[PDB]
Amino acid sequence: MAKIKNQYYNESVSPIEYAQQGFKGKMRSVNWNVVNDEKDLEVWNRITQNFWLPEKIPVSNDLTSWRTLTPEWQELITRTFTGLTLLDTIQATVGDVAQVPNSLTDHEQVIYTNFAFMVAVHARSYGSIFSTLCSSEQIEEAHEWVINTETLQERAKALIPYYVNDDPLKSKVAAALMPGFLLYGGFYLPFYLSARGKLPNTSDIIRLILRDKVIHNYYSGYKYQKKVAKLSPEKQAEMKEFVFKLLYELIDLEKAYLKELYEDFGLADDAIRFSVYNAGKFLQNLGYDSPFTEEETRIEPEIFTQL
Amino acid sequence: MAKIKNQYYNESVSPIEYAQQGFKGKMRSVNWNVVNDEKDLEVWNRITQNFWLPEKIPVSNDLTSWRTLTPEWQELITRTFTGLTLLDTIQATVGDVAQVPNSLTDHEQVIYTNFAFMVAVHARSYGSIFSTLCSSEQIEEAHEWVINTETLQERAKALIPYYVNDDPLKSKVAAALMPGFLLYGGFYLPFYLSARGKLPNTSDIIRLILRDKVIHNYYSGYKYQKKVAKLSPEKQAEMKEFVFKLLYELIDLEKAYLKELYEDFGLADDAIRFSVYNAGKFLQNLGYDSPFTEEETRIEPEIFTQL
């Protein structure tokens, strides 16, 4: 009989929904005075207060440390970081922006535009490190190595087709696998170096990148769970099967890449365990149980501390 | 005979191009150490150093000023700003993100993710103003008015179909029309109030929004001109015809809306001239000549100063 508060919201659509429906409906503005899910406001406040730029970190203080490393190890660092910059590039320009039309709330739509911009800043910060420490030849040979190393490329090629959003839940899982899983095999190396007193200022940038990417992974898992809980029991079963199948395939690709990257340095076995440990955390973030054994996820305490 | 510097760039594609080509090619990371167009670096540096959040502005200092306004004028401000928040919402979630795959350079792809995030901040800042000054009833009735006012909706509905990117140059023009043209009929009102000593702290937020949106318009015009200059003379003619046809149609829609919004307050005639003045600047930003007369673009010096 009586009008409810904010009835206009039920008689309108967001602009992206207007487009998805084929251009029908009355469009509403975002309402930041009525937040439908308090978690959206909490995350908005945290990610915007955490804004940073790499020019504030004195990476040049690392030059003495960098010059004590052999050319082989300088090459390893440049290659590893350039491979991470590729993942950043995919997230910023494809994966995170593809989540905007997958949103449950108006406020979530713009939180993912923050995510995409901040992982662009992460890619910029790797550039800033190279500008300070590397020679032009080191930089160019790392970019050549990235495009020509098939084990590296295959990890990226496995995930990009899901961002076409044929299925919004599969897209969201494929997006979260970047900051929630593929990050960690590369971050093993700065954690290893930091524990041995090398490149302390570079490590500060690594920790700022980590602070952002952890929230990106958490928020995607939160929205995944809220949507999956509304599906039928058999659709929930199909989604759980897809997640495990995709993750197992990606672990195989990641193991092959980390072996190629690290084997000559003796770091491959430890980095793979570090990666699989974080695959277990990734599943828990989606509301699933981890199947991995204690032995295959063992981490050195000094790496756990750096984390 | 000899390899050129950065040959890898010519043998690879960005991730969005890999997707556009149907999943073929070797993917390259962004290279922030080799910037192909120096203008991209300049704009990246400016927009990131200009980061701001509305919580830093003491809008509560405007309460005394706000309480001297009649309820009719408080309603006008709330309606006008909520209509601007709708435009912000379209830019953040549809228009600016649609420019990422239209880019000429890798660096441009992530500059547009910054644009989308910052116009989300603009929408947030209008919310922040309402939280401080408005009653809950004022806020709700403005959202109801936005969805139910056809002259307001028609301006948005005219532009959204171009963001599907059937034509990247038409998409880019439709994107730039938001910060480059539709902004100004709404910004007439805070400029009018500020010139009369009302709401000085709100005006500071307006000027921060303006500082961002001006760069958004400029950068889109720069990339429009660089691409159009590579087309055949007859394709350049077709594009110029489209721009003028679309702008003239949008001016008609904007005039109808500003008359409905402002006529009872006596502000409509001045606001329309202010709008058409900026339509002339919009054409110049795309490399075209303005056809508008001095009489139809006349601005009060006090408004020109506020600008």
Residue numbers in the entry:
A (entry chain A), B (entry chain A): 1 to 307
Please give me the paper's original passages concerning this structure.
To circumvent photoreduction artefacts, we used XFEL serial femtosecond crystallography to determine the structure of the catalytically active radical state of MfR2 at atomic resolution. The active radical-harboring protein was crystallized in batch to produce a suspension of blue microcrystals used to collect room temperature serial femtosecond diffraction data at an XFEL source. The resulting dataset produced a model of the protein at 1.5 Å resolution, and the electron density map allows unambiguous interpretation. A short H-bond between DOPAY126 meta-O and D88 is present with a O–O distance calculated to 2.41 ± 0.05 Å using END/RAPID error analysis. A striking conformational shift takes place upon radical acquisition between DOPAY126 and D88: the dyad undergoes a coupled coplanar (but not coaxial) rotation of ~22°, with an additional rotation of the aromatic ring of ~12° along the Cβ-C1 axis. It results in a 2-Å displacement of the para-O carrying the main radical spin density, away from D88, and a reorganization of the interaction pattern around DOPAY126. In addition, a clearly defined water molecule (w1) mediates a new H-bond between DOPAY126 and the ε-ammonium group of K213, which displays a different orientation facing towards DOPAY126. In contrast, in the radical state of MfR2, this water network is disrupted by Q91 which undergoes a large sidechain flip towards D88. Our data suggest that Q91 could play a key role as it obstructs the putative oxidant channel in the radical state, preventing radical quenching by further oxidant access to the active site. In the immediate vicinity of the side chain of DOPAY126, residues L183 and F187 undergo large conformational changes in the radical state of MfR2, leaving space for the positioning of three water molecules (including w1) and creating a water-mediated H-bond network between DOPAY126, D88, K213 and Q91.
